[PDB]
Symmetry: D3
Subunit: 306 residues, 6 copies
């Protein structure tokens, strides 16, 4: 079988998100790193066995793919599609490589990132760097438990991993990243009950609102998508809080994995463009996307055979 | 193909056992809960990732099944069979629903139980509620390590999960519960060596007694059962100590999972009714069963498709 | 230099509260136990070094004291004073001995309680037994962080330990216990904002409400007491949640330590009888006291020097 | 007098927050200062036994005059800029210091949010650093950092203001400097060369013998004996920080002492050098980008506002 | 279908290595133990659930196999082959039974070893006993991170477990043990850079040296073996530091598992005898092997069916 | 005030006991180390803040003291007094320096011991080296909880630390070490009840036997000593289990601290020589002392001012 990257691994207490573009004539240096990335992961990771839980997921953008590789392309790989809604906008920003680094400790993440960037120095330009941290009982900056309804086990495997529909890239996945900044002043102006109506779940207990009470423009309502078969379309989210108190930055770093970008994009469209019953996702009234990129995260063996 | 409940999950340091009967005209409320139980489990459980280890196993009694569902019944589902032995008696007590809730912390168990009972309020009558706690190095109230010979891996899967013998209910299991109260005064009257002869294992080291020394009326001897094919008949036990010091209650809450109740019942019969070589299980001379109920724990997907 | 009991020790994740009365002619058996209690604590506790954090605080009631001991009495030792307010009542219930047992694990608590009761069997009658457990991020059954404003360090020592004002009992303390049951249905009927106005603190963040917004009948307002010298009167609280889901019991087991019972009683009076600005503590509209007892917890050396 | 948590040990997470007080912001600041310990408990109690949340509040020299009337701490003055032949220790603006520590970053961030929420519109942020533990108590140079910190009574005598200034007993002086390291240059050296810069073995953290230890090594220059012949000591709570993209690999230096003279003597030896050493060799790989001095008063001082 | 021993389990912080020879007429006692070994493992192990991580891997030597069993032999089972190189020698020493005991605590290891030896007393002669301990961030006595490049997941399973090539012993594995003593005085005489050239990896960061800088006589170079198929030949190593400061013993206890001993032996030959480009492994200039034994570790069910 | 060594620190899960004699003309090297010992402790210890709990207590023997220092001697410092009882003998063995190294991890202990011995190499001869480990719930090799009645707080300070009775050495303490080997075969021949009568406490629960049942020749009875004022004379014990399964070594490494050796010696005399009511300590019927040494552990500042 093909061996996937750690795209199915659970949420950790620390994360580093690193997005870079490949400079002119940097292809060679990048290809060398890509073949050594798993090697670097073990080099750092083994030091903190067995509680370290260091992993790195490497993603490659659409434009970057053509510059790096000859032959077949992943069927669903394309640039992030900008969504200009009536009120809210999902922007597309540059990104060739994604490094999604997770561990139970930030030091492990930072050490690995140092090794990666040390090898890439002079071949890449950094676009974005976010240091994520767990906030209390798995909460986001809005004060709600975040990640509850992530699929697990076989359900996760079927939702995330590329299969027979694109057999040359089986074991791969698609990652969509968006950096969100929150308007905390406005958010804290709402009552808890009002906030619950925005999300679609109880704040403290994380219990889902009943279908009779759950608004149609609530986050949970709009991101609940059924396919033609009537089965649920699911994504795996590894969102992390981040921020800077001085600059009044309180953020959610969104990352979602899916076997096809169509699933994530459908959810994006419902959020930004709305449905017949909802103008847009109410969460966006308190959340601004400042980045937006799409990457293909190939199977581990693909990177190694370079 | 069918996804079982957490019937194969290991012992935890905290547990809540909840047994209720369904009131007249409470069927509708119960069916609604049953479809939401896994949802409630995640809602509470996700807060304490990743060390929480919160799980809930839901069981349905024989009489309750007929009230709740139409169509096929699990082949082995029947009311708990009372055993009136010459000396000791295994009583049958009322119970329609079983909630076997486990976590590494009691708060998680209590929180989930609160949500379940909050939804069931006015539709059910509580019969029994036990808060179990780990006692030293996996000991019971008799001071012996308890659970040692539980099957693991494939052996556990084959012993616990319903398979091809009842294909419509594959992935299900049968749970037998008995609340035992111990006569500690009498037990502590025995020497350690005498106690070892009752159980069939060394007290401190938990090493099994050799076959030449192990009495025929010892607990280990009587609960060791070989089937017609010569293979060992096994059950998975999740026993928890409980008690109240003031009321002089020192208890073992027995729960055993098996793919067919015949296995558990055979062991029960040997214990209470005895064999040709043993009058009864010597453990019963220091243990009184005060409850007795049998439940079928269906596959997770069965509950969800309601 | 007198050695106090673990009355200054922090909150743990598990606790057992045990209240018993001494039967007729049980005095001798009780005195023997009291001299061995610290010994039993070590016997169980040492097994779980160093994360066990097993402790037992032993308290003796007013009536019980006279039955047990011959000489001087602690100056502030008296039976719990029942408070019959216009609406709410703080009941006084029987209790001769208090065992406040804490550890990081319930097994340690249960093991010690077993040894104590095994020695006391036939000499005492159990009045109350509560198994307390930590609830999330130090929350009570009302869903609020509970214990925030407990004094620490020197402030705790000055607030809790008997000193020169009663030198024969220096290193002792006074414990007031009340078992509260909560009306969760009524409580969950309120909005979070309304609940915050009852307590006097933000629910999720545990941040105290500003003085301009904090109601006069809020829990925090009424339990804030300044003495004649203008300094704050403080108590050390070791409250634990408890309950049974089936019987719809959601409880707070209140225990407060102070160097004099006057401090705790003042707070009690303000809660139940009210002030000029407040009828009563709004928390009592959702909380019923079902027990009430006062104990003196002597210095460790006092217990050891028996017989 | 009850001191702040200036004697508390190093934690795995820290937030350093330096702000200046805007014109007419004094009132808002004084209100916060009286509530800071209250806010610390509000957040800290949530994580009660593992959390180890603490906040040390420091006040600058210029800020002190704007905030308070009456006596000043004897040693309180603005950070003294040191213009050495080669290296420079810059002085940058800073009125308030918030040194926030915990075993988890969330606790630090939560407390910082509450503090800044109260100070919004009254202060301007100058610096914000999120510190993290790096392996076995290492700094960005790859050396164990904090080994020779005083403990127990020795720490108490070195850090806490006593009878020499009785009105401010239980207080302390904090010097902060944000350092950025030239990792490329540093990693160009052999381990042995690096050891000669620091004055200790890299892996084992064992101090070099006096026969081998260079006179311009970090350990040599920061070893100071007073007129009484006893060692002059400071308590350091240095934390690594950085951003991989911007090539920032930093040490956030913070040192507590009962008098700033001790820290300043060490600073002078580092930047200006001695007769035997031009300067501290560590500075050849380290650039100070901030420099501020604060007085951290006793806890009761803040509360009685 | 066959259940293997814990040969795939990760490194722990404590270990006991026990090598014994079977005395004349001790076969019967040994066979009885072998059938009870898993039983003894559970008896001790269950006490420290779930963080104990107690395991025991039992190995049987070539000569011992013939004395114990009739019928088929594992295809690759033979005595350890002594290697007399020009300079360095890999000695073969006596060993009939191997007990590889691991846990997160030494007490668990010692307790199990006590029970095993208690049963074997008078039937076996101890040859070697080593108490291993974790040294900082997974380091060996040479001060390098040790075990980094161990295979994981499916790769580990394919490298370690006997399969269809010997179907009667599927689920088994081959263990090679060597006790090494290090010349620390000589080693510490080298600069860090010189030490890095001996190993083939950076000392502190554990990052592998680039192929342009990595010497041909470095440890990593010589133990990197590609098969006829062009794929990498891998072994699973569970090396533990040990020693005594007074007697100047600073040791590495080498143990390597592989599906065939040919893999381990190839690496051994390259180390001791060298290649065309390298005289011998430079690590041996600072390391002396004092024991050398080869064992077959059968599937668990093989031991149980005795 | 004088700063003591970590003689009051609690028991840890790992320990190394190191006893050496000073070779001829080794005094200078030893004095240099003694001044650096605290420095070496911090160098290793700080790496594992804050759970490492690394400490080293350095002790100096009577004969060694005269060779190392001029001026005053500790009042109670003398060679270990051999006790030749009717049945059992407490031997005196050579020892000039004691290093009592403790931590929560063995690696820390081993690392520090390496540094100490590295500095002392060629100036000292090792006499004894023991690696101690925690055994279950603070048990010794006899299976009893060991250390229960150790004094704590002020009581410990008054029992252990030299005070005004010898003001020049205030903050110092006296350490007596004895390596005991146990006859486990004989011990396990006794019933639990018989073992309880030997010790004077219940085996499993660690509860002290009542005075009516406690034998006069029990360990607890003989080591209970009251001074002239009727208060108890106490010592602080840091006993650690050790052993080797192959060589049938199951040991207790006894170390006791006291402000004067008279206390420890009184207990020793009662144990070996007996009283009017007891021939000897029954524990000695199952325990053989193979070493015996007495050391003075000076205040920390004494070592530093060298
Ligand atoms: C009265 C309450 C009970 C207590 C305190 C108790 C305790 C124990 C103990 C100490 C052991 C040996 C260690 C172990 O393997 O777990 C054991 C084994 C066992 N018990 Fe029980 N038990 C009780 C009731 C039952 C009941 C009612 C059943 C059957 C329905 C049962 C089935 C077993 C089985 C199958 C074993 C494993 C025997 C073997 O294969 O070696 N137990 N029990
Ligand atoms: C450029 C950033 C700095 C780094 C990376 C750094 C690193 C270190 C290291 C690795 C040590 C040895 C281990 C230890 O005992 O902590 C040390 C010691 C020390 N450092 Fe620094 N340091 C820095 C700046 C400073 C500054 C600005 C001062 C104050 C003027 C200072 C004062 C000290 C002192 C007093 C010692 C202990 C010396 C002794 O008594 O042995 N350091 N530093
Ligand atoms: C003298 C004692 C030995 C020491 C101290 C030692 C140490 C090391 C170290 C530090 C590494 C690099 C990190 C790692 O991947 O584990 C390594 C790699 C390795 N060692 Fe050893 N080793 C020893 C003996 C052996 C022996 C006898 C074998 C085989 C029979 C062996 C096989 C390997 C293999 C296969 C690797 C991985 C190489 C790669 O694929 O990069 N080692 N060893
Ligand atoms: C032969 C090895 C020894 C073993 C296995 C051993 C074991 C024990 C045990 C199980 C206890 C009771 C629990 C406790 O309080 O710690 C105990 C108590 C004690 N032992 Fe030992 N012991 C040994 C040698 C010694 C020696 C040589 C001394 C004195 C020099 C000593 C002094 C004591 C003292 C003072 C107590 C406490 C007595 C009391 O007040 O209850 N032990 N020992």
């Amino acid at each position: 079988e093909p061996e996937p990257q750690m795209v199915l691994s659970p949420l950790t207490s620390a994360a580093i998100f690193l997005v870079v573009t490949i400079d002119s004539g940097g292809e060679d240096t990048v290809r060398d790193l890509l073949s050594d990335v798993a090697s670097l992961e073990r080099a750092v990771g083994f030091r903190a066995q067995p509680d370290g839980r260091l992993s790195c997921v490497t993603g490659i953008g659409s434009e970057a793919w053509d510059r790096l590789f000859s032959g077949a392309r992943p069927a669903g790989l394309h640039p992030f599609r900008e969504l200009d809604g009536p009120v809210h906008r999902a922007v597309a920003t540059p990104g060739d490589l994604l490094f999604h680094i997770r561990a139970s400790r930030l030091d492990l993440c930072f050490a690995l990132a140092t090794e990666i960037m040390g090898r890439l120095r002079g071949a890449v330009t950094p676009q974005d760097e976010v240091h994520g941290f767990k906030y209390f009982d798995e909460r986001d900056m809005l004060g709600f438990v975040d990640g509850t309804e992530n699929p697990t086990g076989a359900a996760a495997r079927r939702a995330v991993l590329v299969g027979a529909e694109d057999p040359a890239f089986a074991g791969g996945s698609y990652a969509v990243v968006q950096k969100y900044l929150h308007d905390i002043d406005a958010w804290e102006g709402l009552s808890v009950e009002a906030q619950e109506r925005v999300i679609g779940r109880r704040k403290m207990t994380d219990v889902e609102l009943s279908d009779d009470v759950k608004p149609a423009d609530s986050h949970v309502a709009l991101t609940s998508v059924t396919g033609p078969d009537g089965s649920d379309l699911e994504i795996l989210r590894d969102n992390m809080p981040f921020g800077s108190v001085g600059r009044e930055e309180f953020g959610t770093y969104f990352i979602g994995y899916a076997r096809t970008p169509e699933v994530t994009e459908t959810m994006l469209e419902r959020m930004f463009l709305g449905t017949a019953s909802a103008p847009h996702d109410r969460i966006l009234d308190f959340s601004t996307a400042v980045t937006g990129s799409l990457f293909f995260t190939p199977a581990a063996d693909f990177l190694e055979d370079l």
